[PDB]
């Protein structure tokens, strides 16, 4: 099928000690401007880095001068790491991400409840782009409205809560208006006083 | 670095003592999958992604070998300088709107984790029911954050974090 390729960690030549490595691909306008940065980290302090804008290893602390000089000599290492912008970033974007991450769309669940203040809870959607607006009798009310930040759920779903300060007199109609890319037409949920 | 999306590919984390390793992929802050180093298996966050793409878990095992190696060398290079601990912070919230009676998930979000070794547990009595923990996530400052999940049937909880950079285990109430 279509396959994820990870970078290749360059190798080097009580009390606890921690090592960590990562490859950060940075896509802007799809694959138009890719940037590729690999980082090696010992005890939370980053010590060696590759940056595709630099074109070669550099050392972020002194403890990393060995590995940056070394990895810059052996061109089997440096040309390969330079090429991981294609064999990892461009490849994973134009490949598996397109069949998975970039195609996930999950429609929000919008429900209103009265804790007076009405709360519009918008849950379990992807991607992150969402607009949530309150109307009163068909009139956008941006006064007394307060939302959460984008709350990331950690299961590939987000969640936002929009509370409105109001006072109900029988007959009034408050509506929560939710715009999202998963949505054909915007969702509206009404609450009659 | 400004960007539209961010693939964070092949995160290899190793620490000794304990031989504790972890290999994950990430996209736009969300975990694609980890490689299980014992059962040697790609474990996807979303099963439905395991059906539309794949990753050979042996790239993970060889990258974890490389990274263990580098941990030995750099341990020695700096003359066995040890890692400094951190105080992690939790935050407890529900997955869906809390409707007494209907089934829901309860999310404990811990951050400023370093090193990546934490115990995260949950009425003033311990629970091991619908507990799902996530992998360690990467922070821009090279600390970690982890999310624990507890499925519960709401009715009229404390997240208990036990770490090293915590003088006493901390509780966040519900």
């Amino acid at each position: 099928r279509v396959s994820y390729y990870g970078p290749k960690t360059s190798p080097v030549q009580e009390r606890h000690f921690v090592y960590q490595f990562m490859g950060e691909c940075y896509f802007t306008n799809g694959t138009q401007r890719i940037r590729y940065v690999t980082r090696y980290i010992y005890n939370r302090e980053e010590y060696v880095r590759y940056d595709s804008d630099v074109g070669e290893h550099r050392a972020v602390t002194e403890l990393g001068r060995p590995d940056a000089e070394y990895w810059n000599s052996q061109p089997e290492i440096l040309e390969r790491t330079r090429a991981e912008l294609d064999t990892v970033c461009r490849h994973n974007y134009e490949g598996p991400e397109t069949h998975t991450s970039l195609r996930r769309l999950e429609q929000p669940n919008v429900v209103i409840s009265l804790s007076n203040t009405l709360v519009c809870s918008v849950t379990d959607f992807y991607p992150a782009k969402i607009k949530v607006r309150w109307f009163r009798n068909g009139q956008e009310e941006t006064v007394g409205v307060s939302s959460t930040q984008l709350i990331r759920n950690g299961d590939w779903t987000f969640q936002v809560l929009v509370m409105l300060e109001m006072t109900p007199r029988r007959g009034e109609v408050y509506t929560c208006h939710v715009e999202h890319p998963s949505l054909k037409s915007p969702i509206t949920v009404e609450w009659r006083a | 670095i400004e960007a539209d999306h961010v693939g964070t590919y092949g995160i290899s984390v190793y620490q000794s003592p304990g031989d504790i390793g972890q290999y994950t992929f990430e996209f736009d802050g969300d975990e694609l999958f980890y490689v299980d180093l014992d059962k040697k298996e790609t474990v996807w966050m979303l099963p439905e992604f395991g059906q539309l793409a794949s990753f050979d878990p042996q790239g993970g095992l060889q990258n974890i070998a490389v990274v263990k190696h580098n941990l030995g060398v750099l341990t020695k290079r700096s003359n066995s300088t040890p890692a400094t601990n951190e105080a992690p912070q939790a935050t407890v919230f529900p997955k869906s709107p809390v409707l007494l009676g209907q089934p829901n998930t309860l999310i404990c979000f811990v951050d400023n984790i370093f090193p990546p070794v934490i115990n995260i547990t949950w009425n003033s009595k311990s629970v091991a029911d619908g507990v799902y923990e996530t992998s360690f996530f990467v922070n821009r400052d090279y600390s970690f954050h982890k999310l624990s999940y507890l499925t519960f049937i709401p009715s009229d909880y404390d997240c208990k974090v036990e770490h090293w950079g915590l003088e006493e285990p901390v509780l966040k109430h519900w």
Partner: T-cell receptor
Amino acid sequence: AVTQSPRNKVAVTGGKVTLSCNQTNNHNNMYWYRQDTGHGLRLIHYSYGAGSTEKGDIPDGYKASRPSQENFSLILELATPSQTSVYFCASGDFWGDTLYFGAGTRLSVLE
Amino acid sequence: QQVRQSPQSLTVWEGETAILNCSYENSAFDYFPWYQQFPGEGPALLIAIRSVSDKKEDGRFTIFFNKREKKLSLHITDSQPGDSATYFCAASETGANTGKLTFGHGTILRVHP
């Protein structure tokens, strides 16, 4: 260099044979192949570093053991006549373009 | 995914160019090393090509790579009799970081003086 031991071995069905491989290239990866006609070279077990071993394509009947960066040992606990063959060990660096083989081990398992 | 080599054995007289043929069925393979095994010994790296090239030249030995047909050929010119050995075509997709390598079944080249 990569050397194996023993170079030749006779054994009966149902005994414990232990091929063993030593490598002094400061390599990390070590492999255990077998060579039979009609089948080319076939991977049995391999390893990425000391403590770890991985199941190759034909792991049935063999165990492996990598106690050291330099040793890597194929182990047959109940040898069969189907396990007679020529075994080669290999090593290589991380992400290396080259495998480095040993001279070979002829093994006969006889009823 | 398999690697298939032809012919299963080749006999050549001192001077001819031997031609060992290989093909693979997995389009993701991108590194193709050929291993030479002398009798009684263990195989050693002879010559390797990468998928971004269509020909690697080294002495009397040359790899010809063809990506569209998924086909390789090793050409030995001025075939000495000491070239007699079994020649293995091998392939990996390097991207998967696995470490394993897929081996052809070998062709036995027996050169006559």
